[PDB]
Design a protein around this ligand. Structure first.
Ligand SMILES: Nc1ncnc2c1ncn2[C@@H]1O[C@H](COP(=O)(O)OP(=O)(O)O)[C@@H](O)[C@H]1O
Ligand SMILES: Nc1ncnc2c1ncn2[C@@H]1O[C@H](COP(=O)(O)OP(=O)(O)O)[C@@H](O)[C@H]1O
Ligand SMILES: Nc1ncnc2c1ncn2[C@@H]1O[C@H](COP(=O)(O)OP(=O)(O)O)[C@@H](O)[C@H]1O
Ligand code: BEF
Ligand code: BEF
Ligand code: BEF
Ligand SMILES: [K+]
Ligand SMILES: [K+]
Ligand SMILES: [K+]
Ligand SMILES: [Mg+2]
Ligand SMILES: [Mg+2]
Ligand SMILES: [Mg+2]
Lengths: 520, 520, 520
């Protein structure tokens, strides 16, 4: 289509106006005295949220150029989220603060492409300075604090996540789901998403689930349809007394029908459940189970018949629990040598994972061998969703603090790094201004946090910069102090991520001399 | 699409204006001197109703922001309904009254997120205070009163529900349907909607129905067409003397034809009726019958032939009654262990029911095992529907009073709790104002009830607050007295639910600093 | 969609304006000096009609609220029609007259919900008072009068319906159809809609019909295709001399072909006709015939072969008449014990009929055992349809007078009841006004009838109220007298029905404080 083409200052002013709308909608949620944003949503009720990326993703403006502005800087907030899990508002606030200052310089005749070089240099330095300030965070008290600050000063959420990480370990997974109840709730477990195939197996109608006591476990790679194949193994289990779980690709009617009438009567106690997964991942996961239980995968492809299996090839467990949705193996017989060998193998499979998706499902399996769910409580569903948004953010920050340490919150970390880089220069004057642009932007987080409390950001900024180390402003309590002593901890990873991403995008945005878009 | 983005006070004023339209449409129905709302309805006649949620669900406003207001607070009324069954108007009135007072504070510079904390704290306290005031309600007189007040002072409805609960018990179900007649009507019963397949079975032409005395019961999952399958079992029943009921998927002509000539002559006494339901629900229900009668479901799918059944697999009952429309099994042989085991299973099936429809049919079956129907009478159909709306509400309130006690109605319960929390404070001033916001809102129900009588709400409120305990205003009679003595009982569960839900939503709504929606 | 929401007086004024349009279109047809309404109709010619519900059903207004008004009160006219069959205009006139007076009171500050209670009480009383005044109506002269008044003073229609009810009895059915001729026409009949299957059976080419003299009757449930099955019975009829009628599901070619050549020659005299009905109704009706004729239904389903039938199982009749369209059995051998037993069975089948359709076909069969059609004559088709509309109304009123007696027409019945309830009071003042609202409305029918004659309704009303008993205004003749002596009879059922339904709806309509509808 025919295009509208704008140049120079006109293009930039539009680009900014756009940035500001997105920025201005997100910035209002920053900090403990941050407020919430309402996002209308076509199919049913609107959403109240503090989560900066959530606000950002919805912004789209009418004016084709302004929109372009907002649509580019939206990526800062968005990428922060995909890497860190928190800091999305901070990231957005920095980005604005750069873009704004940079463009002002561009208008003064300075060469954008150098302003960029400055900014980028100042940031590469700031990243390293932050790694210096970073003190690690591994005790449950520190983690609970990060969690708490991350969930907008909700101590329960901190406490609860800290408890969770303590229980699953570090090679273990934590999810968050909507609770039925009014208060928060933590559940801890190997399990996979498969129910009984035969609802006539439930041996405890109390729970509506099958509870096989100290059973054998048959791992069939192929899908079963004839009871002939089972007879040899079913026989040895019938003369052993112990029950049996059958985890094959599928238990077809002809061979299912029978199995039912056999437990129906009490001849053998057997359960049938599909195999966890699809394709090569199934055989991989099915193998994981064999290792935990000390059984052999009866793979039809690698020269085994299901009839030539014996008690030998069956896994064993202390207990088994299966319901309409999930199957759980409690404490398998498999030796911990074989297990941790199998784990350090899958651990290096995640190293060569060049795609995120290949990494997801792999660490899921290592957690099954080395898992927890937090259920979020609230009165209504508008409440549920702002709370659940905070819990996720908190969990992310906690995992990030663990893996990269913490720094003083209240945006002081950045303010310090800015004073430490006060001597940084570039190859020429424009690059210098570029550095100074970035350093001045580093104050923005603190400044906005203070501004959302309705106090004079210049005055607070000055007072924090007059101090040392972890002296900062506690926006919640409205007085100064030692941020680490007051539990106001941001993960290093998030503060770093915010800064890097804002800089990346904002840097480029300053180099805009022409804009091309469709006509209205 | 391009979005309209509004901030701060503008956004809030719009949000309120919206809340008020919904609120203002619902509030007019509050209390005995409440009036009705007419809701136009595209396909045919309009609806007259007092039921506050019904009005709420229809509100949708033109202005995109105002709508957002109304669409959020709509959830208060809506959730009250899903939890309690009554109090939806009250809930809505509170919500408004909070939002309004809170936003006024937000405009005074107070920190919304703290106003929220206050409100929420005041409410958590009020919930506990209400549990103190709650006296239980288990005698039929008290229940009839709750029912009566709930049905806008209709004593018949109270009386009739009280009678119903007395007869079904507490582990028994009550439904409401449109009556054909002009006056109300209660019917009480395991039974299901299926008649005889063969009209030539009626062994008592007095009633035009089959009355099988102390019979066996055959439960066939598959549909029958050949008499071959029957011969083995039919044989053992023919040499046992006792009659037989056959409840299979269907009794086809070839196998039906015969069965007739056999009872025709007196060789065996047999009835044939289709199975209750369709698909997986049929097999589920067919199984319920087996448990009540001590029989086995002869399921062709899970490896059973109909020929290999014996007297073993047949259920038994004390008596059976079947007519053109319904089949009734009176007092089955099944052991109450197996029954209540089967029930506590279906009881937890209703827990995981995430859809309303999955909940309906499940509790229907538990009533068949552990049932009454109220038919509502009215002259026209406009009348039918407002009445039926009141009966449902009443029934809900009665069931809620039973399970959580009652408190003094006329909104006095809340007014008392408010005087008891007069000393409640928070961590800081903004939180205090937040508490006071909630306590002042607690007066709104009484105030609106009085205002719908066209009398001075301040004057009545003052006079009730000057009193003690259950002193209140009786809006119907226009004079003060002891609300429990005057039968003006609200269930605790509903009063609590109203307050909790209003607070949840309204709390969040006060934290609004930005709104994002589509352009017009 | 976005809604328009109106409150209080605004909403009510709109609601009324709507009611009035519908009311005002219907009221013009009231009474003997009533006029007609023309209803445009998309597919072809318009409709002229006096029938008040017919006018009502077409009204739909542009203004969304006014429409709501009209759409609710439309139900009065509509329900009157479904219950009574006449009085739809009267009902509509009352409804208006209540709504109007009630709303005026609501505007004076009186509590709508009490105004309702008053109205309803006054009506429950009026219903009983009317049952007092009701004198029964069973002589043909009285019925002819009701019919006449009902058909807007058309004596022929009265006379003709009176003759009809006299001939079919009270357990007999009357239909009305369009006539081919220019004048009205009554036809009277056991018979059913089936002709000969074989046109080569007509033994009297004068009429073009088969006249079997004193024959046997074979009732075959199954459909016949082979002459083998017939031979046993056909044999015994061939050696008996008497002819035979065969009423089976069908007489197929192979078995039809033969039967023809046998009567063709004079070996046996046989007729073949399909069975009356479809499905379970066929077997039911086929059974009715067996009872009237003293034969057995040879039902293949309940263990009978057609070959094992003998003269035993054949019905018998005095004469049989069959043409291209219908089969008639004149005076069957069946004993009147068995017949009236079969009838009092089908009579109670119509009691449990909860659907209108289940009632239609049942009383059709009782008439066949214990039926008439009125053909309406007119010149054109515009004429046909107003006339046919009056005949139906008349027939309905006659059947209603029969079942619930009559009262003095000209709306005097209601005027009397109003003077008798002059002392009725309620629990409080608002309820009193509510009663007075209803009593004043009871004058409206008379008042409107008089007003359609262009005479002063107040003056006539006063003069009738000054009188006693059945003194009334005869609007046709324009002078006063004894309404029963002048033949001006309304059925009690209709007068009662009108009042009850108007009150039901109008009562509720007065309680309107808010209206919610879509935007324009
Ligand atoms: N009590 C406090 N005083 C000062 N700063 C705080 C306090 N609590 C949290 N913060 C800071 O405010 C920041 C707010 O983060 P948040 O508003 O969730 O946005 P983001 O998406 O950037 O995490 C945190 O980095 C933290 O350093
Ligand atoms: N006669 C009365 N006097 C005072 N209050 C009453 C009387 N009858 C009912 N109420 C109160 O009015 C409230 C009205 O409930 P209702 O209008 O049905 O709305 P909701 O959806 O809140 O139940 C009840 O909680 C009850 O306490
Ligand atoms: N000659 C008459 N004088 C007075 N009233 C009459 C006369 N003929 C009929 N009426 C009255 O007028 C009414 C007219 O009924 P109609 O206009 O058909 O409306 P509806 O639908 O109410 O039957 C009858 O109830 C009858 O009482
Ligand atoms: F805005 Be962040 F995700 F707390
Ligand atoms: F408005 Be409530 F449901 F009585
Ligand atoms: F208007 Be009524 F049906 F005579
Ligand atoms: K945020
Ligand atoms: K209500
Ligand atoms: K009329
Ligand atoms: Mg955060
Ligand atoms: Mg109520
Ligand atoms: Mg009439």
């Amino acid at each position: 289509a025919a295009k509208d083409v704008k140049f120079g200052n006109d293009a930039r002013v539009k680009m900014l106006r756009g940035v500001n709308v997105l920025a201005d909608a997100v910035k209002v949620t920053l900090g403990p005295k941050g407020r919430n944003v309402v996002l209308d949503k076509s199919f049913g009720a609107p959403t109240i949220t503090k989560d900066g990326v959530s606000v950002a993703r919805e912004i789209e403006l009418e004016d084709k150029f302004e929109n372009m502005g907002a649509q580019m800087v939206k990526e800062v907030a968005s990428k922060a989220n995909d890497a860190a899990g928190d800091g999305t508002t901070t990231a957005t606030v920095l980005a604005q603060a750069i873009i704004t200052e940079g463009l002002k310089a561009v208008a003064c005749g300075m060469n954008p492409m150098d302003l960029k070089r400055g900014i980028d240099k100042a940031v590469t330095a700031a990243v390293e300075e932050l790694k210096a300030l970073s003190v690690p965070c591994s005790d449950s008290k520190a983690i609970a604090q990060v969690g708490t600050i991350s969930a907008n000063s909700d101590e329960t959420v901190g406490k609860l996540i800290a408890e969770a990480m303590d229980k699953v370990g570090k090679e273990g997974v934590i999810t968050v789901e909507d609770g039925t109840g009014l208060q928060d709730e933590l559940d801890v477990v190997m399990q996979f998403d498969r129910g009984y195939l035969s609802p006539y197996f439930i041996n405890k109608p109390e729970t509506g689930a099958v509870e096989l006591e100290s059973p054998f476990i048959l791992l069939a790679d192929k899908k079963i349809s004839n009871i002939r194949e089972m007879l040899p193994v079913l026989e040895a289990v019938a003369k052993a007394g112990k029950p049996l779980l059958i985890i094959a690709e599928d238990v077809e009617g002809e061979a299912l029908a029978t199995l039912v009438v056999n437990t129906m009567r009490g001849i053998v106690k057997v359960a049938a459940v599909k195999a966890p997964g699809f394709g090569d991942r199934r055989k991989a996961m099915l193998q994981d189970i064999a290792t935990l239980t000390g059984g052999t995968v009866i793979s039809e492809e690698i020269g085994m018949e299901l009839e030539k299996a014996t008690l030998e090839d069956l896994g064993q467990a202390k207990r088994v629990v299966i319901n309409k949705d999930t199957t759980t193996i409690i404490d398998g017989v498999g030796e911990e040598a074989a297990i941790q060998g199998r784990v350090a193998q899958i651990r290096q499979q995640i190293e060569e994972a060049t795609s995120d998706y290949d990494r997801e499902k792999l660490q899921e399996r290592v957690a099954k061998l080395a898992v927890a769910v937090i259920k979020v409580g609230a009165a209504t569903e508008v409440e549920m969703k702002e709370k659940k948004a905070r819990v996720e953010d908190a969990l992310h920050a906690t995992r990030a603090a663990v893996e990269e340490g913490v720094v003083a919150g209240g945006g002081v970390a950045l303010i310090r790094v800015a004073s430490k880089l006060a001597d940084l220069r570039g190859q020429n004057e424009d690059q210098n201004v570029g550095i100074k642009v970035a350093l001045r932007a580093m104050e923005a987080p603190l400044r906005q946090i203070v501004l959302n409390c309705g106090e004079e950001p210049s005055v607070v900024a000055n007072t924090v910069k007059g101090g040392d180390g972890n002296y900062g402003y506690n926006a919640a309590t409205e007085e100064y102090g030692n941020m680490i002593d007051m539990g106001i901890l941001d993960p290093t990873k998030v503060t770093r991520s915010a800064l890097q991403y804002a800089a990346s995008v904002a840097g480029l945005m300053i180099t805009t001399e022409c804009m091309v878009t469709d006509l209205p």
